Design an enzyme around this catalytic site. Sequence first.
Site, PDB file in Angstrom:
ATOM      1  N   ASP A 102       0.826  -1.197   0.000  1.00 42.51           N
ATOM      2  CA  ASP A 102       0.000   0.000   0.000  1.00 42.51           C
ATOM      3  C   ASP A 102       0.866   1.254   0.000  1.00 42.51           C
ATOM      4  O   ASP A 102       1.936   1.299   0.608  1.00 42.51           O
ATOM      5  CB  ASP A 102      -0.925   0.002   1.215  1.00 42.51           C
ATOM      6  CG  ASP A 102      -1.968   1.097   1.152  1.00 42.51           C
ATOM      7  OD1 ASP A 102      -1.696   2.208   1.652  1.00 42.51           O
ATOM      8  OD2 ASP A 102      -3.061   0.847   0.602  1.00 42.51           O
ATOM      9  N   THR A 109      -3.919   8.481  -2.120  1.00 41.96           N
ATOM     10  CA  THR A 109      -2.677   9.207  -1.879  1.00 41.96           C
ATOM     11  C   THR A 109      -1.624   8.879  -2.928  1.00 41.96           C
ATOM     12  O   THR A 109      -0.800   9.731  -3.280  1.00 41.96           O
ATOM     13  CB  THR A 109      -2.150   8.880  -0.487  1.00 41.96           C
ATOM     14  OG1 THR A 109      -1.452   7.630  -0.526  1.00 41.96           O
ATOM     15  CG2 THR A 109      -3.299   8.763   0.486  1.00 41.96           C
ATOM     16  N   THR A 110      -1.640   7.649  -3.439  1.00 43.43           N
ATOM     17  CA  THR A 110      -0.678   7.265  -4.464  1.00 43.43           C
ATOM     18  C   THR A 110      -0.819   8.140  -5.700  1.00 43.43           C
ATOM     19  O   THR A 110       0.182   8.561  -6.289  1.00 43.43           O
ATOM     20  CB  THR A 110      -0.862   5.795  -4.829  1.00 43.43           C
ATOM     21  OG1 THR A 110      -2.262   5.499  -4.940  1.00 43.43           O
ATOM     22  CG2 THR A 110      -0.246   4.906  -3.771  1.00 43.43           C
ATOM     23  N   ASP A 115      -9.086  -5.057  -2.013  1.00 43.01           N
ATOM     24  CA  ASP A 115      -9.480  -4.156  -3.088  1.00 43.01           C
ATOM     25  C   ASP A 115     -10.800  -4.575  -3.719  1.00 43.01           C
ATOM     26  O   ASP A 115     -11.581  -3.713  -4.138  1.00 43.01           O
ATOM     27  CB  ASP A 115      -8.385  -4.095  -4.154  1.00 43.01           C
ATOM     28  CG  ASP A 115      -8.082  -5.453  -4.752  1.00 43.01           C
ATOM     29  OD1 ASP A 115      -8.836  -5.898  -5.644  1.00 43.01           O
ATOM     30  OD2 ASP A 115      -7.086  -6.073  -4.328  1.00 43.01           O
TER      31      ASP A 115
END
Lengths: 490, 503, 499
Positions: free
Chosen positions: C50, C83-84, C365
């Site tokens: 993550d 955030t990625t 996911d």
Amino acid sequence: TGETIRSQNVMAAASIANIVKSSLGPVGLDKMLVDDIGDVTITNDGATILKLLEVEHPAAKVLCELADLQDKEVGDGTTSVVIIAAELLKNADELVKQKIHPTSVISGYRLACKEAVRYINENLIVNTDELGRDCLINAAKTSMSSKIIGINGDFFANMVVDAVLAIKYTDIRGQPRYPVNSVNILKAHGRSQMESMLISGYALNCVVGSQGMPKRIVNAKIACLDFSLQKTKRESDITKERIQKILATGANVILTTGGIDDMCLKYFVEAGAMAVRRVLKRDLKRIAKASGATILSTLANFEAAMLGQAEEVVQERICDDELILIKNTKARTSASIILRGANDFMCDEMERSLHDALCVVKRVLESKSVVPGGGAVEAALSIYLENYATSMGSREQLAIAEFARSLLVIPNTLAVNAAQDSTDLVAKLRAFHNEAQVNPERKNLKWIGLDLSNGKPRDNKQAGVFEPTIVKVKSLKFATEAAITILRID
Amino acid sequence: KSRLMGLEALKSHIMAAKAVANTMRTSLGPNGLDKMMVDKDGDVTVTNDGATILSMMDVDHQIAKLMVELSKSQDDEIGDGTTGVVVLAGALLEEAEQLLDRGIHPIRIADGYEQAARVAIEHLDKISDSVLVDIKDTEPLIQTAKTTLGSKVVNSCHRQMAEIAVNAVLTVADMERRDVDFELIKVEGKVGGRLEDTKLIKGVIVDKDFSHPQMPKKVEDAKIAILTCPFEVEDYKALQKYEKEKFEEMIQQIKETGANLAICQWGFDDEANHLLLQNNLPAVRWVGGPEIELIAIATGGRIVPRFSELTAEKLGFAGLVQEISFGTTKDKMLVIEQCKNSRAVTIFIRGGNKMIIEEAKRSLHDALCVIRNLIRDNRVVYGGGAAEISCALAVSQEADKCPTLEQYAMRAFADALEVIPMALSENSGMNPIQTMTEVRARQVKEMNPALGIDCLHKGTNDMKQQHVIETLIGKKQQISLATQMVRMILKIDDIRKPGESEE
Amino acid sequence: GTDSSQGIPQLVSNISACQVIAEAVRTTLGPRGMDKLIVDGRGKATISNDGATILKLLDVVHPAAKTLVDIAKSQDAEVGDGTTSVTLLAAEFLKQVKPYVEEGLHPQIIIRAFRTATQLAVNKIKEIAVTVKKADKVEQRKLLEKCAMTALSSKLISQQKAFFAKMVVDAVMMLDDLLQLKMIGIKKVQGGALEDSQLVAGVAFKKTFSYAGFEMQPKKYHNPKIALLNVELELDYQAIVDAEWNILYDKLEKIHHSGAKVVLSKLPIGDVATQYFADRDMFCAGRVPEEDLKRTMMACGGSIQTSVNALSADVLGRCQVFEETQIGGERYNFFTGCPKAKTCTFILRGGAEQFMEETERSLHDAIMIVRRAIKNDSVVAGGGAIEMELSKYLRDYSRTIPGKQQLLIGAYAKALEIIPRQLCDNAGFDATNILNKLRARHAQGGTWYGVDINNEDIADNFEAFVWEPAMVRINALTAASEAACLIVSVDETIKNPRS
Ligand SMILES: Nc1ncnc2c1ncn2[C@@H]1O[C@H](COP(=O)(O)OP(=O)(O)O)[C@@H](O)[C@H]1O
Ligand SMILES: Nc1ncnc2c1ncn2[C@@H]1O[C@H](COP(=O)(O)OP(=O)(O)O)[C@@H](O)[C@H]1O
Ligand SMILES: Nc1ncnc2c1ncn2[C@@H]1O[C@H](COP(=O)(O)OP(=O)(O)O)[C@@H](O)[C@H]1O
């Protein structure tokens, strides 16, 4: 430390270009070139800068050689070709750094160059026809702008364009040709330049030759010579027998560069010959090639039909100065412009402006295919090539994109040397050229360039900032060739 | 100043992994070089089993750490071949480095290795010529014990320990779950002795003391108690009165419940012991704590530390009557073996050295585990690298039919699987490459799949006569775990160590 | 010796710090991106694919990186883990604007251009967002399982994950009360095949030495509830024997007195005396995890006991059923059957032990994508397709703007291209070729073509069922642009140290 010698070559090229970058355009700054023995040189154009700059890097030597070769083709754009090549080198180096092999970059550059030269050929101007009148006028005015004579610019403009058009030749190939030396200057004393009237033939401001010339003679043959008709002590004394023989051959207006004959008055009412001291060689050759006659060093011997002819001769006073109206000869070379004023020194900028206007007119008269200047074409091709590249899909997409992006350095440099922020000028140019293609009805907008005097975008087809197509085509080709040669290095 | 970013971190990880593998690649096989072990205190032991070496080795790099902790997850299922797992992992890491030298992305290498591993799994399934009737295989089990114990002079008394082991597992093997539980610890290590001193005893042996220096050890009664109560002249008279009252009430509880041999784990008075001896029942003082389960499981009972929980059905039980010289100079212990066979049986070992005890118990554990797999799944394949060579040939064949970079991973996986025969040949003091390629040529020209490496320098490379064998599921688990190891370590690209500020 | 404290030097240093913090987590983008190990400082190294977790556990010292990671954390707390796609996007915005700052462009012009471009992109995305929420999602959910199984295609897991998706979607529908990842989890069970894995509507915890007291508990009991104990149940010289005896007596008596079915305590229970702890006549437990506690009082309704013999009506209260079975050969703990059981703990039955990480990166996911598809209605194609579309709009619109903003909006547009590039690079296939083909086919052919993670080719992610809600993408892009402009607006830093 150091690596990737390709980057070293690119940096050497970038430095060489930056040496000459600031001098691009008519308003460029000067460079002072110092040799080993201490002498200095001041110049504006970068062609002589490259011809005089001491290059030492092997990579930069290739650019110097290619720029010199470009000089031998048309003699213009060496600064532009060097700058374009340097921008291409920087962008190709970045593409290599982002893991694109130079082979694909070179192929993309070749395709981009071919597409650019094909696109330009279908968006240039050939309107330098007989119907092109105002364009030449305001081209001359732009070459003559920023001067106090702008109040009465139009009269001088139409005078000079009429003078340049009325004297054109027609060569073997049929392409009209113009010698700059054909038209000369002629000072006058008294009233200012506003009353200057174009002289249909060469006029010399010297002593009055003779009054024997009628209002218009049916035949005026130019029997030009080079000796002084002076009494001495096929004749030992060259006053009577040689002139009698040449008149028997049919010499109407015998030209004498040197002294006048002592008894010329009696011979000039029955033959009407010419006797005025100090005939300029620059104008003597021009009038000889106009009428078709040749200078005779000696007459003791071809002389009947070889000598030239003039339609009429006018004896009149212009600006309180007697001038000789040897006009309407065989070939149109004989013409002059009277410079009404007091001296050539106070009107030095005026005559220089007239000369540069004549030069910029003769640039566009020859090579009937012409393109707008002031960075218009670079922005147009920059818009073209991005859309061309996005339709490829190969690995050469980024190469063509960077070619298009780097092609904008010329208008950017022109704006920088013009003391305006290049960002706004370049952005405005690109914005105007965008709607030139996405909006078909606004098609009459491609000829939008940047004005160096005011630093705002302005149409140049109407203004007259013009360049030969061959110059830009060769500049683009040579920049691409130099860039490819540098990228092949490893 | 400097930093470790990009693929350089991965290269360092490969370097550490291959260093660990090179450390462990010399002790593989029966003729593998033995490895002593030293502690920081100074403890010295010499063990050839790689599981212990991995378990107690001090590794500083995080890669080698991760390696050892997720390699320790191999002994529980199988208990053998950990050295094989680590050697295979190192070979895969080195081949992956070779591939990365040419610019392959690690993800492609990992997926190629995964497909190669699965392909090798089906191939190894289809090649094995196992026997599924090895349930009443007491005679082949002798060969299995010999193969698991062919590294030392142990073969002298393998002719005894093999039947010892088969009887032990017969007393343990149950056809409903087929496993060994916590309380079935078949371990009794006695330092000093001989090969014959290690024999078959299905009894409970402890190192505790007697009630009396010359007490009668013949206590056949199963009424054996366990005491969890500790020892917790005016004061002396009060203490004596308390002791007498406690003795009387405890004897009354004995009579009510029926738990005669009240063994206590704390101090007491010997006068009570003498009085009880006069009453024909012993009482041992200062006995062990966690020995209740082992004593009670002698016939089936469980731990009963409560005073009244030890009933007739849960007495302190005893295994089977036998009285021999437990110790000549060592303090002889009680006979706590009279009644019935133990479901959680324990064998007696009296080897002459610590290392012989260690090797005996670890070999017995591995033997019981692998045959636990056999009763679970009696699929076996011929070891000695023959299975590795067959898998390598199959993988190399699969290498051609793939257009992507997976062919490179196929080739690397084959060249890494071939390492095990190389290691076996090298540890046997013979030319590794030449012998391995000779066996490979023999297997490609002759369809026999049991052609391996003659590690013991016997007659032929074929293990049919040599009876070198191991469970198929063991090989599959080993290969799959090694492949998962290399796959999961190949994903890792950067390690950010805290505290070490980057100046 | 390198220093930078003046306005432009401060800005370039700040955006270089943003560059390095992006590089720290650049390669983890994508469903199958790289993974990183970071030590906690005491040797307990952590492994996590993550991206948000890496930033959470990373130590940040630079103020620019500090504010960027705070913006990232703020993005995390709202919608999933974007955030990625936010840290990377903002950092590459700054990297793209590097040269223009170096050339003397004023930061306020940059901020205005970026804000204009962001507004244009957010307005333009809403003309492309397509809703398929009504088209057979709550009823005849075949589209929803199609979208769920899109997550892990091109794998042998597809046959089993079809049932997995059907069954987890059944769980979500029967627990459609804004489920989170706290009330839903996975418990590792050793052994068994992949198809053997199932779901239980209750807790699932293995019994250990200190966890469970004794077996044969009354499993089929119609009203078992939870009991919480804060007093030890374990076992002048002679003055403690009577006290210990009384303590043991009352501890044994309390189990029958209060009538608690199962007692949960924060203390270990000695299984060496299993029969001794079985004398309570009722099941007792110890060493309960905090998650196990929190999952049992809000569902079943367990009480709290703090006295020696505390009594309550919630030790034997109303809950449906008790389950205690030897799953996989080991007896687990199941406090199922609760009146308001918002609990569905997934029984992870599988052979390989390393499949736990596969489930961590594979199914959390799937539940996340199905929850995201349920919550929102309008979605756009993922895999960088929408990023290329926004880049095309913005790049084409920039050339219509006269002024300094043209170059900056063009730089913003070409900056927006990083996400497909990062995806295909993490996939291992080289970015240049695939990205160029994507750009050509996307400026010409379609508005939703994107990178394919499996076959490494241009794939129509819309027809590939790669759904990203319009609102989530809008918020992520707005947050990234706001972070970039906030970093740009800063030109001076003041420290005022201690000494
Ligand atoms: N009157 C003008 N108005 C605008 N631009 C001009 C004008 N004259 C020259 N330029 C620009 O100057 C550039 C180079 O011209 P010049 O310096 O004369 O050639 P070179 O660089 O070969 O010496 C051309 O690109 C042209 O656009
Ligand atoms: N009869 C035999 N002849 C030759 N080699 C053998 C024989 N039996 C076993 N081996 C070798 O022993 C190796 C496995 O032992 P090892 O891995 O050291 O045990 P552990 O797994 O406990 O470390 C195999 O690689 C195999 O080649
Ligand atoms: N299976 C897939 N195929 C193609 N693209 C995917 C797939 N899974 C995720 N992506 C893309 O990866 C991008 C980044 O995802 P990321 O933000 O790392 O996930 P998370 O939100 O869990 O952090 C998303 O925009 C999405 O479009």
